[PDB]
Design a protein around this ligand. Structure first.
Ligand code: FMN
Ligand code: 9AU
Ligand code: ORO
Length: 378
């Protein structure tokens, strides 16, 4: 806990964008820490057939163009959610477009879907997908592929379509990002009427299943190779800033469509007075410790309103396996981190896994599967 939070004397900051860049340069070229503990068999979760050997995982903010997803994942994580990968490459907003709020343990940011392109990112999944089995054959590093629209396409439904065409076959779970505050009216695609039109279109390009056998796990890599027969569990990442009315419209359209899961909360555009740090007034959604009750309620509301029959991967201020314990108790099968690592640091994957496992030991039940949603047994 006390690494960077104790040692934050140096002025405003060492720039977050710059830091993340030279961090990911390290991530790209090995040059990182390493988890060794193998993770207790307690912490494994079979979210709809998907074996999450650990339920802790890196969120979609980090490895934005598949620079090093397995290397973050060998560094203690269970899964790694890969960017928001827009069809055509985007530059993003003008920098400085991202800020630490040291006091508040938070990060406001307005990057705006800065992507390399499915042109660039497909090859890198073509890379990862075939060598991920090879390198050290990990109890496969479960792999999230998150996709969106470009700044100004008329039909996002097309850019999700393209997305699912290209980079679907590698994802253990695919993710439609409809939530970022930092793309023009994208969040307003979460509507009952649109959400459906997208979700159906998106599982319609999954309905492109192609044929084979017609001219150790050495070679599971062949075919469309997602630790199984391809089909990613379809997800949609939803907002934190929503009416009970709009969380119905979602939850209804979730159970209507047979959506395989929901990722609970992107960043929040709320600014709760309590934020003391003088960067509180910058635009963009804020992550981290202010997004605690926000996210954790959003898990619980979407759990119950989906009868729990839809899966939940909650992000939003998951700092310590206690926060993970509660979000697991509120509905989450697995949980995500990003802004919690910018204060904890690389070996926070190993920390949150074990903080969770001991608070399971203390709570009584071990093996999380029993644990999920526990809050909805009265
Ligand atoms: C700089 C930054 C970039 C992000 N980029 C993305 C993104 O490209 N796609 C996405 O789905 N979420 C993105 N997020 C949201 C995170 O994935 C996550 O949902 C949010 O930060 C809450 O998690 P945390 O409080 O546990 O860090 C980003 C967050 C930050 C702070
Ligand atoms: C300065 C440099 C070239 C590398 C620093 C990384 C390192 C070895 C240790 C941690 C030092 C540090 C202050 C990191 C800050 C950091 C961020 O502020 C940050 C902000 C947003 C997204 C990702 C980020 O990753 C970071 O490592
Ligand atoms: O690209 C961004 O600016 C961005 C994407 C996202 O999903 N969430 C966020 O807070 N910012």
């Amino acid at each position: 806990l006390l690494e960077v939070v104790y040692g934050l004397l140096p002025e405003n900051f060492p720039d977050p964008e710059l830091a993340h860049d030279m961090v990911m340069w390290l991530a790209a070229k090995g040059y990182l820490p390493y988890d060794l503990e193998r993770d207790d068999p307690e912490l494994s979760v079979n979210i709809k057939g998907l074996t999450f050997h650990t339920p802790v995982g890196l969120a979609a903010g980090f490895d934005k163009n598949a620079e090093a997803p397995l290397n973050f994942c060998k560094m203690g994580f269970g899964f790694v959610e890969v960017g928001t990968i827009t069809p055509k490459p985007q530059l993003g907003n003008p920098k400085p477009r991202i800020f630490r709020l040291a006091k508040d343990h938070a990060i406001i940011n307005r990057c705006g879907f800065n992507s390399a392109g499915l042109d660039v990112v497909e090859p890198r999944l073509e890379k990862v997908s075939r060598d991920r089995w090879h390198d050290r054959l990990e109890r496969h590093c479960v792999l999230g592929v998150n996709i969106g629209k470009n700044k100004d396409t008329v039909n996002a439904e097309d850019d999700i379509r393209e997305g699912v065409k290209r980079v679907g076959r590698f994802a253990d779970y695919l993710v439609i990002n409809l939530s970022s505050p930092n793309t023009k009216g994208l969040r307003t695609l979460q509507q009952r009427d649109h959400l459906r039109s997208i979700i159906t279109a998106a599982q319609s390009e999954l309905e492109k299943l192609e044929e084979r056998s017609r001219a150790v796990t050495r070679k599971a890599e062949q075919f469309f190779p997602t630790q199984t027969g391809k089909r990613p569990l379809l997800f949609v990442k939803i907002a934190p800033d929503l009416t009970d009315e709009e969380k119905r419209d979602i939850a209804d359209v979730a159970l209507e469509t047979g959506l395989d899961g929901l990722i609970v909360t992107n960043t929040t555009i709320q600014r709760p007075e309590s934020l003391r740090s003088e960067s509180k007034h910058e635009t963009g959604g804020l992550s981290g410790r202010p997004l605690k009750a926000m996210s954790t309620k959003c898990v619980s509301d979407m759990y119950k309103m989906t009868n729990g029959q839809v899966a939940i991967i909650a992000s939003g201020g998951i700092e310590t396996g206690l926060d993970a314990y509660k979000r697991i108790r509120a509905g989450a099968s697995a949980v995500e981190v990003y802004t919690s690592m910018i204060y904890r640091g690389p070996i926070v994957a190993r920390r949150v896994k074990d903080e969770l496992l001991n608070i399971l030991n203390q709570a009584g039940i071990y093996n999380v599967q029993d644990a999920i949603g526990l809050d909805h047994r009265p």
